[PDB]
Amino acid sequence: MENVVSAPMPGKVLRVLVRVGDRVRVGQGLLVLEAMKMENEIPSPRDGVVKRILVKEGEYVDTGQPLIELG
């Protein structure tokens, strides 16, 4: 059951913290989203493997936009 991490709010991708193929833990930061005058680390919802990274540093995203797919 692959699943997708989508943006919970609009903002700018400031940093991507993982690479395709990385093992991740639940709660691990996948990227940093600039929003509400803060940096916001967007978490993995579960243990797994990063299958796809769908955004790049510098990119603006909106709510519901797919960011990361887990395998």
Author numbering: 79 to 149
Article excerpt on this structure:
We previously determined the crystal structure of the C-terminal 73-residue fragment of PhBCCP (PhBCCPΔN76) that represents the biotinyl(/lipoyl attachment) domain of the hypothetical methylmalonyl-CoA decarboxylase γ chain. This domain adopts a flattened β-barrel comprising two homologous ‘hammerhead’ structures that confer an intramolecular pseudo-twofold symmetry reflecting the gene duplication. In this work, we used the C-terminal 70-residue fragment of PhBCCP (PhBCCPΔN79) as the template to prevent the N-terminal heterogeneity that was observed in PhBCCPΔN76. Moderate deviations of up to 2.53 Å were observed at residues 114–116, which constitute a flexible β-turn harbouring the Lys115 residue to be biotinylated.
In the PhBCCP system (PhBCCPΔN79) residue 138 was selected as the target residue for the mutation experiment because it is a solvent-exposed and nonconserved residue on a surface β-sheet. The isoleucine mutant (A138I) and the tyrosine mutant (A138Y) conferring residue 138 with the highest crystal-packing propensities for β-sheet provided better crystallization scores when compared with other constructs, including the wild type. The A138I mutant and the A138Y mutant produced another orthorhombic crystal form belonging to space group C2221 and a trigonal crystal form belonging to space group P3121, respectively. The crystal structures of the A138I and A138Y mutants were determined at resolutions of 1.9 and 1.5 Å, respectively. In these mutant crystals the crystal-packing interface involving residue 138 differs completely from those of the other two crystal forms. Neither the C orthorhombic nor the trigonal crystals could be obtained with the wild-type protein. Therefore, it is conceivable that the substitution of Ala by Ile/Tyr with a better crystal-packing propensity created novel packing interfaces. On the other hand, the crystal packings of the A138I and A138Y mutants are rich in attractive electrostatic interactions and nonpolar interactions, respectively. The numbers of nonpolar interactions normalized by the total buried ASA for the three crystal forms were calculated as 0.108 Å−2 for the wild type, 0.099 Å−2 for the A138I mutant and 0.135 Å−2 for the A138Y mutant. The order of the normalized number of nonpolar interactions corresponds to that of the resolution.
